Amino acid sequence: NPLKRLLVPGEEWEFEVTAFYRGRQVFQQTISCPEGLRLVGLPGWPVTLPDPGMSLTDRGVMSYVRHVLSCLGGGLALWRAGQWLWAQRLGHCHTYWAVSEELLPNSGHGPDGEVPKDKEGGVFDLGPFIVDLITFTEGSGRSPRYALWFCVGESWPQDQPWTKRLVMVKVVPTCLRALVEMARVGGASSLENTVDLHISNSHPLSLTSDQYKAYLQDLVEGMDFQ
Structure with missing residues (x-):
């Protein structure tokens, strides 16, 4: 199962980082690194x-x-560590996160949580994401979300950054965006489509909807579920 590659330790995932100031895009970069990344103004790119x-x-x-x-x-x-994506705030900025669509909606609701400082925190789990991707290839569910949004505030917790969202950073693990694109552009026909996993030393593979779905099913066995 080629998709099982996503999980093996050492396989570096590619991350697209896009920052916004006042809802306006001011920066974008695509990094790939074994210790992950660090948004700055210790390991990690x-x-x-x-x-x-x-x-x-x-x-x-x-x-x-x-x-x-x-x-x-x-x-x-x-x-990344295993099937999870971990985050930790090393500085003094109160930082909150949320898993959402490619564009974060204004939606009077709070963030999924605040990024912890003393210890790492789980922010994304590939497991439930892949099961959803499956139910999506069948046409009985909605496309799973994969965009990580980090709202960065000041050190003084009185500005309530999540409200005005002046400093937003979107992080997208490119393999996941590619996996959903494969699902959609897969029910279009019944033949072969090529999907780029966007991980280290990986050759893009062409599969048919059937083959792709079979691999996603076996992929679930390679992850933990409570």
């Missing part, structure tokens, strides 16, 4: 968010962002 002065004109908003970049310190660490 450092991803440096840009100074607002290079894209904003509002004095008030720029100041806020300069404060966020100032509390990041060690930064927001995100890495």
